[PDB]
Design a protein around this ligand. Structure first.
Ligand SMILES: [Cl-]
Ligand SMILES: [Cl-]
Ligand SMILES: [Cl-]
Ligand SMILES: [Cl-]
Ligand SMILES: [Cl-]
Ligand SMILES: [Cl-]
Ligand SMILES: [Cl-]
Ligand SMILES: [Cl-]
Ligand code: NA
Length: 129
């Protein structure tokens, strides 16, 4: 499923992500934009052999099990395939764990490089929320 911008903002808000760990909804929409272009089915292999999954490109080295990432963990206790669903519940619940891990949203390199410090409220501007 490819979400619309405001559609995803609304879904993230319904699942409790708005201001989660102090990160406003626009931060989450911005991260999803540059991680997946709002596509729940996005996957991307990493050089280390792990894979990133879903709207927030959650990595198999630590957070989900895909059966092919040697030495990895599954700290969200989910198959990585769950992160590709049209229902964003699994991605949101796992993202809450990731953003609580110590470095905030810097865990998402693309958030640090493309969203951090910018006018992230633009990503929810105009949306009925
Ligand atoms: Cl957009
Ligand atoms: Cl917010
Ligand atoms: Cl915002
Ligand atoms: Cl594995
Ligand atoms: Cl584990
Ligand atoms: Cl599994
Ligand atoms: Cl959803
Ligand atoms: Cl923080
Ligand atoms: Na894993």
């Amino acid at each position: 499923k490819v979400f619309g911008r405001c559609e995803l903002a609304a879904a993230m808000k319904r699942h409790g992500l708005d201001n989660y760990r102090g990160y406003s909804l626009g931060n989450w929409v911005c991260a999803a934009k540059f991680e997946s272009n709002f596509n729940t089915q996005a996957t991307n292999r990493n050089t280390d052999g792990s894979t990133d999954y879903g709207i927030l490109q959650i990595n198999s080295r630590w957070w989900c099990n895909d059966g092919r990432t040697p030495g990895s963990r599954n700290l969200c206790n989910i198959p990585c395939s769950a992160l590709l669903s049209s229902d964003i519940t699994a991605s949101v619940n796992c993202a809450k764990k990731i953003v609580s891990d110590g470095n905030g949203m810097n865990a998402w390199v693309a958030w640090r490089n493309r969203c951090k410090g910018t006018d992230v409220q633009a990503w929810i501007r105009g949306c009925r929320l």
